[PDB]
Design goal:
2 copies of one chain form a homodimer. Chain A is of the alpha+beta class. In chain A, about 35% of the residues lie in helices and about 40% in strands. Strand 1 (about 5-20) of chain A pairs antiparallel with strand 1 (about 5-20) of chain B, so a sheet runs across the interface. The PDB classes it as unknown function.
Chain lengths: ~80, ~80
Amino acid sequence: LEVGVYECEIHLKFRLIEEKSLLSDREQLLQVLLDALTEGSDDFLETLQASVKAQEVSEFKASPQMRRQLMRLRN
Amino acid sequence: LEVGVYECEIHLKFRLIEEKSLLSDREQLLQVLLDALTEGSDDFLETLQASVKAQEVSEFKASPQMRRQLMRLRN
Protein backbone atom coordinates (compact mmCIF):
# COMPACT_ATOMS: atom_id res chain seq x y z
CA LEU A 1 0.00 0.00 0.00
CA GLU A 2 3.03 2.18 -0.87
CA VAL A 3 1.95 5.76 -1.73
CA GLY A 4 3.89 8.59 -3.35
CA VAL A 5 3.45 12.27 -4.00
CA TYR A 6 3.05 12.87 -7.71
CA GLU A 7 3.22 16.09 -9.67
CA CYS A 8 0.75 15.68 -12.48
CA GLU A 9 -0.27 17.52 -15.57
CA ILE A 10 -3.30 16.91 -17.78
CA HIS A 11 -3.84 18.78 -21.05
CA LEU A 12 -6.90 17.66 -23.00
CA LYS A 13 -8.73 19.11 -25.99
CA PHE A 14 -11.97 17.45 -26.97
CA ARG A 15 -15.42 17.96 -28.50
CA LEU A 16 -18.46 17.01 -26.47
CA ILE A 17 -22.19 16.81 -26.97
CA GLU A 18 -23.79 18.01 -23.71
CA GLU A 19 -27.01 19.48 -22.36
CA LYS A 20 -26.75 23.27 -22.27
CA SER A 21 -28.20 23.49 -18.73
CA LEU A 22 -25.23 21.45 -17.39
CA LEU A 23 -22.58 23.89 -18.59
CA SER A 24 -23.91 27.13 -17.24
CA ASP A 25 -22.67 26.85 -13.60
CA ARG A 26 -19.03 27.92 -13.16
CA GLU A 27 -18.57 25.77 -10.02
CA GLN A 28 -19.87 22.55 -11.65
CA LEU A 29 -18.42 23.01 -15.17
CA LEU A 30 -15.22 21.07 -14.62
CA GLN A 31 -17.00 18.23 -12.91
CA VAL A 32 -19.48 17.95 -15.80
CA LEU A 33 -16.53 17.69 -18.20
CA LEU A 34 -14.65 15.16 -15.99
CA ASP A 35 -17.86 13.04 -15.91
CA ALA A 36 -18.04 12.97 -19.74
CA LEU A 37 -14.29 12.17 -19.93
CA THR A 38 -14.86 9.33 -17.48
CA GLU A 39 -17.83 7.98 -19.48
CA GLY A 40 -15.68 8.16 -22.64
CA SER A 41 -18.58 7.47 -25.06
CA ASP A 42 -17.73 7.81 -28.74
CA ASP A 43 -21.37 8.86 -29.35
CA PHE A 44 -20.80 11.96 -27.18
CA LEU A 45 -17.07 12.63 -26.98
CA GLU A 46 -14.16 13.01 -29.34
CA THR A 47 -10.68 13.44 -27.84
CA LEU A 48 -8.62 15.68 -30.07
CA GLN A 49 -5.38 16.12 -28.12
CA ALA A 50 -4.28 14.44 -24.85
CA SER A 51 -1.16 14.85 -22.76
CA VAL A 52 -1.03 13.07 -19.39
CA LYS A 53 2.05 13.31 -17.15
CA ALA A 54 2.60 11.95 -13.62
CA GLN A 55 6.05 12.08 -11.95
CA GLU A 56 6.92 11.13 -8.39
CA VAL A 57 8.40 14.02 -6.42
CA SER A 58 9.81 14.42 -2.96
CA GLU A 59 7.14 14.79 -0.31
CA PHE A 60 8.61 18.14 0.85
CA LYS A 61 6.80 19.59 -2.18
CA ALA A 62 3.38 18.55 -0.76
CA SER A 63 1.02 21.00 1.11
CA PRO A 64 0.98 20.86 4.98
CA GLN A 65 -2.41 19.09 4.82
CA MET A 66 -0.97 16.53 2.35
CA ARG A 67 2.25 16.00 4.36
CA ARG A 68 0.07 15.24 7.44
CA GLN A 69 -1.95 12.80 5.33
CA LEU A 70 1.26 11.10 4.25
CA MET A 71 2.33 10.54 7.90
CA ARG A 72 -1.16 9.25 8.67
CA LEU A 73 -0.90 6.69 5.80
CA ARG A 74 2.65 5.57 6.49
CA ASN A 75 1.89 4.97 10.19
CA LEU B 1 -33.17 19.12 -23.07
CA GLU B 2 -31.31 21.38 -25.55
CA VAL B 3 -27.83 19.98 -26.35
CA GLY B 4 -24.87 21.59 -28.09
CA VAL B 5 -21.51 20.56 -29.44
CA TYR B 6 -18.76 22.08 -27.34
CA GLU B 7 -15.07 22.37 -28.02
CA CYS B 8 -13.40 22.06 -24.67
CA GLU B 9 -9.96 22.41 -23.24
CA ILE B 10 -8.73 21.38 -19.79
CA HIS B 11 -5.23 22.20 -18.55
CA LEU B 12 -4.56 21.16 -14.96
CA LYS B 13 -1.39 20.92 -12.89
CA PHE B 14 -1.70 19.36 -9.48
CA ARG B 15 0.06 17.31 -6.79
CA LEU B 16 -1.52 14.08 -5.65
CA ILE B 17 -0.91 11.45 -3.02
CA GLU B 18 -1.70 8.08 -4.63
CA GLU B 19 -0.93 4.39 -4.30
CA LYS B 20 1.98 3.47 -6.56
CA SER B 21 0.22 0.34 -7.91
CA LEU B 22 -2.57 2.54 -9.36
CA LEU B 23 -0.27 4.60 -11.56
CA SER B 24 1.66 1.90 -13.32
CA ASP B 25 -0.89 0.98 -16.06
CA ARG B 26 -0.78 3.33 -19.08
CA GLU B 27 -4.42 2.59 -20.03
CA GLN B 28 -5.82 3.36 -16.56
CA LEU B 29 -3.54 6.28 -15.59
CA LEU B 30 -5.81 9.07 -16.78
CA GLN B 31 -8.86 7.54 -15.18
CA VAL B 32 -7.03 7.22 -11.84
CA LEU B 33 -6.17 10.93 -12.05
CA LEU B 34 -9.74 11.93 -13.10
CA ASP B 35 -11.06 9.94 -10.09
CA ALA B 36 -8.80 11.90 -7.67
CA LEU B 37 -9.80 15.20 -9.38
CA THR B 38 -13.44 14.22 -8.94
CA GLU B 39 -12.92 13.33 -5.25
CA GLY B 40 -11.17 16.70 -4.77
CA SER B 41 -9.90 15.91 -1.23
CA ASP B 42 -7.53 18.48 0.25
CA ASP B 43 -5.88 15.64 2.21
CA PHE B 44 -4.79 14.03 -1.09
CA LEU B 45 -4.86 16.69 -3.81
CA GLU B 46 -3.52 20.16 -4.35
CA THR B 47 -4.52 21.99 -7.56
CA LEU B 48 -1.67 24.19 -8.69
CA GLN B 49 -2.91 25.57 -12.02
CA ALA B 50 -6.34 25.14 -13.70
CA SER B 51 -7.66 26.36 -17.02
CA VAL B 52 -11.10 25.14 -18.11
CA LYS B 53 -12.65 26.30 -21.40
CA ALA B 54 -15.91 25.19 -23.08
CA GLN B 55 -17.24 26.98 -26.20
CA GLU B 56 -20.23 26.01 -28.30
CA VAL B 57 -19.31 25.30 -31.92
CA SER B 58 -21.24 24.42 -35.02
CA GLU B 59 -22.20 20.76 -35.19
CA PHE B 60 -20.43 20.35 -38.57
CA LYS B 61 -17.24 20.15 -36.49
CA ALA B 62 -18.47 16.97 -34.71
CA SER B 63 -17.35 13.40 -35.73
CA PRO B 64 -19.77 11.31 -37.92
CA GLN B 65 -20.65 9.21 -34.83
CA MET B 66 -21.37 12.41 -32.84
CA ARG B 67 -23.41 14.02 -35.67
CA ARG B 68 -25.57 10.84 -35.77
CA GLN B 69 -25.99 11.08 -31.99
CA LEU B 70 -27.09 14.68 -32.35
CA MET B 71 -29.86 13.70 -34.84
CA ARG B 72 -30.89 10.89 -32.51
CA LEU B 73 -31.23 13.37 -29.59
CA ARG B 74 -32.98 16.12 -31.51
CA ASN B 75 -35.58 13.68 -32.91
